[PDB]
Amino acid sequence: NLLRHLKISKEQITPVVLVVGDPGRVDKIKVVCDSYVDLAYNREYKSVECHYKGQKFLCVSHGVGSAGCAVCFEELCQNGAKVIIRAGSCGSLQPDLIKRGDICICNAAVREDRVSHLLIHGDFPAVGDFDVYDTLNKCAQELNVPVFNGISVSSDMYYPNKIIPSRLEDYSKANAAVVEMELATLMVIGTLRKVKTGGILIVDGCPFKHQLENMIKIALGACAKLATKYA
Amino acid sequence: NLLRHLKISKEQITPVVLVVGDPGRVDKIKVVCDSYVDLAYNREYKSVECHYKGQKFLCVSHGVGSAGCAVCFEELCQNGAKVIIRAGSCGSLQPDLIKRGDICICNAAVREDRVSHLLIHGDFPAVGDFDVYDTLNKCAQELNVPVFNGISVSSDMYYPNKIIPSRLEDYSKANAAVVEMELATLMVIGTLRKVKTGGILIVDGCPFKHQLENMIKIALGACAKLATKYA
Amino acid sequence: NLLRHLKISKEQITPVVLVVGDPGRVDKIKVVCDSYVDLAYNREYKSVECHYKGQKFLCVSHGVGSAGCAVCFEELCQNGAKVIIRAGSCGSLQPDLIKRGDICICNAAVREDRVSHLLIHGDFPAVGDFDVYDTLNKCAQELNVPVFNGISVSSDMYYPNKIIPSRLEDYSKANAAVVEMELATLMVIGTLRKVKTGGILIVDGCPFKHQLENMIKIALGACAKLATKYA
Amino acid sequence: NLLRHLKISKEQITPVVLVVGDPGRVDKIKVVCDSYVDLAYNREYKSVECHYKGQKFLCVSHGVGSAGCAVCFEELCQNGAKVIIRAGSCGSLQPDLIKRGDICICNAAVREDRVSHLLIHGDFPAVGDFDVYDTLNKCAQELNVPVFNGISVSSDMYYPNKIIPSRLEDYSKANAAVVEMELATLMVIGTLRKVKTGGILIVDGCPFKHQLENMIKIALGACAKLATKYA
Amino acid sequence: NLLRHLKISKEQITPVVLVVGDPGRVDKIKVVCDSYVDLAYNREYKSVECHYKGQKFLCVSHGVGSAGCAVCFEELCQNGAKVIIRAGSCGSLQPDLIKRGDICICNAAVREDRVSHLLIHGDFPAVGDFDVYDTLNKCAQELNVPVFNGISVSSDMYYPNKIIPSRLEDYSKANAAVVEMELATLMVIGTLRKVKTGGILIVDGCPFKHQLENMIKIALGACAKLATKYA
Amino acid sequence: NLLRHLKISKEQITPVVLVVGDPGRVDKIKVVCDSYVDLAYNREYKSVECHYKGQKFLCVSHGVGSAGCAVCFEELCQNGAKVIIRAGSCGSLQPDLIKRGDICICNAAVREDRVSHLLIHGDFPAVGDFDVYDTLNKCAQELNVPVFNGISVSSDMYYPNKIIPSRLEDYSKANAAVVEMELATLMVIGTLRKVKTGGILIVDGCPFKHQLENMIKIALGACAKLATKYA
Numbered sequence A, B, C, D, E, F: 001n002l003l004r005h006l007k008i009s010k011e012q013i014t015p016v017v018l019v020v021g022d023p024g025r026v027d028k029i030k031v032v033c034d035s036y037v038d039l040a041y042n043r044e045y046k047s048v049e050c051h052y053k054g055q056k057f058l059c060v061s062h063g064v065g066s067a068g069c070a071v072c073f074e075e076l077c078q079n080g081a082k083v084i085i086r087a088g089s090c091g092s093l094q095p096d097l098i099k100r101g102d103i104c105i106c107n108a109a110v111r112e113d114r115v116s117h118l119l120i121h122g123d124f125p126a127v128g129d130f131d132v133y134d135t136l137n138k139c140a141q142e143l144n145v146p147v148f149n150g151i152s153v154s155s156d157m158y159y160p161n162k163i164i165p166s167r168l169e170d171y172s173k174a175n176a177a178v179v180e181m182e183l184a185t186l187m188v189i190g191t192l193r194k195v196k197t198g199g200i201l202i203v204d205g206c207p208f209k210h211q212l213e214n215m216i217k218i219a220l221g222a223c224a225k226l227a228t229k230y231a
Ligand SMILES: O[C@H](c1cc(C(F)(F)F)nc2c(C(F)(F)F)cccc12)[C@@H]1CCCCN1
Pocket: A021, A064, A089, A090, A091, A092, A155, A157, A158, A159, A179, A180, A181, A203, A204, A205, A206, A207
């Protein structure tokens, strides 16, 4: 009784799941835990059980882009996952303030996908669980890692054309901090299925004009903290 | 140099502002503080300086509905206000779980207004500041008052007709907790102007099928806590 | 058996109602009638029975903005009101032609609200009753007061930002005369509930780059004329 | 220097124009005037100069549907026409009240076209000139012909399918009286170009479940009345 | 048992129909066939039975614009027509490449109408039948007539205003070749009713900055080829 | 000078590219060619040079979903690819007619993504190149493999919820044949960048109520045929 795309079973699903885009990132994360168990690898979806600080939680890759990741997240959320934290990279939308390697823990997101709109009307917020956000922030503080907080623009467009103007500049003026491609989708799906979500991101560019290791530490720390509550 | 609709001046604006819909509610709130100073009353917008736990903060009425309240909130946000907490009433969207007199502290809202859409594209979240939410929650806990947390549906429609179906049932299924008329507007305006916002509401009905005093205590407590940081 | 927000009863509702935004305006209007009876004051909604030229009609304040005023107008329309005329202020959209203190009697309006869209699809016109418009015009003429006629832009945005362009310039080029915030809402609600509506406005600004007394006279005149038909 | 589709020249354009859909209707109208002059016939656009009650005005066919008629109306409005009255047939949207052969003089219309939306944002009303409406009504009264007044639903769909529900039932509940295909387009174009418009229609069906001659008389009467003002 | 607007009967409908906008074009086409039979002329809809290369097919005029032509096309498609090819004129959207008199055979179209949107959601393509396109192309080649291939922008706006920008420039950059007013409507209706459609157009202008006879030959050739299959 | 996500270089890009969703599918395809060269594997994007019938063309995996695949397709289209054919699986939208294992070669698609809408207005068709479609069809015929032809619904939603109705039933009634998740995106991107595209799909389910090998043969055959033209 395996999940259709993750090819893992319901019993293999822990309460806390760390998600990342790249299956290769799962491999670099697992070796930084105390131990791990490889579970499956199907398409872009790679699943490993991570063991860290006496706690147990999966790390799963979701692929690039909202529709791809919705299949991952739906399979998790409908099969016992209670907390999903996305860790990844992003573009800065405030290049004067937030620079290469800076880390942003996000509370909400702009819904520039389609799938969330196929699930619920556009007016509904893409918003993470406060507790997951508080936990992520507290782990950062404990490790003395400075971080930013803010809204991420989640967009299905990576390569713009020159016909329809990009809204990234509008959202920068609206004080959105960063840009990526899956957080909003995660948050809407999460909310609809009673799954607590959050997101922590490392800036690796700007669309306009050691830190990684720390980001990962923060994310694994938050997962261990959250996991403790369900064990 | 008075504000056009609030008829108060920039110097009279404290860092923290409590907002409520009804000017009569301002009067019932002020007398529960240690002392107060009546500042102005113009149209539906009543402003009083509240004194509570050694702290100083305004209580301002915003009127019914999103466009009316946007004029209030814009005048505050553009003239020195740093934290705005809305306190009011709402309908329950989960009548089995959340009942008459229950109190909900909200993290985000559904944007069923127009004014927010005239300010920023629909995909952008209506989301409150986490710190304001954490503060509100902590005051509740300190007073041993149980509370719910969740998304509020902010709608410009109070009296439905029978032509266009209401989305309230959709949003209830999407796990939105409550319904009111101004929170989303507050949150978008707040975000756009770098003003930290939040909302605490008391259930007084359902669109489908002592506690007040406690709500007010929580709200005044959070305002005093937040105010301390800027004095 | 009181109306929920107006706090008046069905029997207190006359066939003709004059509506204005500001409760203070009700007070300045009532004293210009032959006599009056104060009925209620709840939130921003102030109701007074006006007596003028042997006729009987209410003057009710509706607050600022479309959602707020929809609660007022729905309570009136569902409880026996047959004719509602809004009197108020507006911005000029044709500053070369229509200046400070000029009076505009409006036949239709731009629906830049939300509530009307929650009632009926966007394609439907916001249009006043011709008879109410003809009456308003005829009273103006009788008093030898010059007036303009045209479409009003009804917008939920008073304070623009600099992200999303305002449509006010588009509508000025489309030959819309004035701008305000509630007429469209009135007209749609009116049409949906078989209530005859209209609007007369005095210019008090421009968003781009004695007369009051006369406006009020015109409005009270039209109300007396219309009221005569139902008594 | 002929108009591109009407194949008439600017000098041949009178201040008042009667428009109808069918070129054959122009022929049946012209012979009921005192005299006439055939001007042109190109595609569906037939133009004749009508002479009636000592007055001079064109009767022009506009074809079926909004985009077709917009070319007619734009050529008229940009080349000296001041008043355009559409006369035609329609479906009843209130079959209990308004029956086969009843005549409706319309004040406004539902914009279920595209071309008007390519000219101006959806929120803007399709509304006729009050004076043209008053004139049409007064001619009816003079001839003792009973008439209805109301909003027409102007739709680009004549033959519905069974996938997307028709809004005709919604608009019937919204108290729209009749349905046709060009009035809204006329009214928007009219408003944008400072041309006074109106519409008088005879019911010839229902989408749900002697009089002609009188309609035509009313229309020719109104044209003669309006024309007198510019001669 | 006549069709309501075409005024022909079901038995008079051939499997292949050539459609054109102008009823006068039907007259110039019929005389180029081997023989013909005039069937009807009602409003802008002129129907003639064409006889060419031993084959039998109608030529029908559809009028200007999408809503008008939808009535024509629906009456054909619901009454036995299997193949509809539109032949007409268009504007070039690539003036450097495609010039006056050049001929474009179109595979798909931009849906800038309303009626198609009243039939099926905007996301659905306006696309012709490949076989009809292949046939049209092969007839061109047989007659050694050079042709272009591409998407046509079908727009309900002929005369732009200066408020809402035209999308024609956007679609030119998107590599749309030509512009006209009815192809998209034909293609959607065709697809919905299982009718095979296509379009061949001759450039006669640009919105920016012998060949006819050949176009007609190509169109009559394709109709004869297609007709052979059903006889 | 490697492509950012494909991690191949411009010189490694052939004129014809076969694309598939699953990187594992690339592996099963390559071994069926005469020979191959593994080029790269980064994230879900696996690239191999295929050698077949004396011809040279890449096979590249694009991942699940529209936004993910747009990064793949944009990198190809902007770096020398002239023909992209997608081969994959789909759901049947006509379960009576089109069954498990049946193969559909698609001419156009429904744009239920977001990224295409961020590139060009919704009215623009998602349509493949006719020549690629003709080639695919001819290879099928040569191998005596029966196939269907039609429109695919491309949707970003795989797992529906029960709040917002799925349009799949609407599109089935509109005669769309199949459903998948990337074809529309491919086709729009293709059209915008002057890249010829197409799609061949094998039915493996229905959302309502040997053949593989043949599909692959057809796809490799079409790629070899198309490649011959550029070598
Ligand atoms: O989402 C991450 C990301 C996205 C985008 C955006 F969507 F705006 F173009 N920009 C990114 C940037 C950018 F340079 F800011 F543009 C840097 C790092 C990651 C980015 C990447 C997207 C490609 C796949 C990996 N995630």
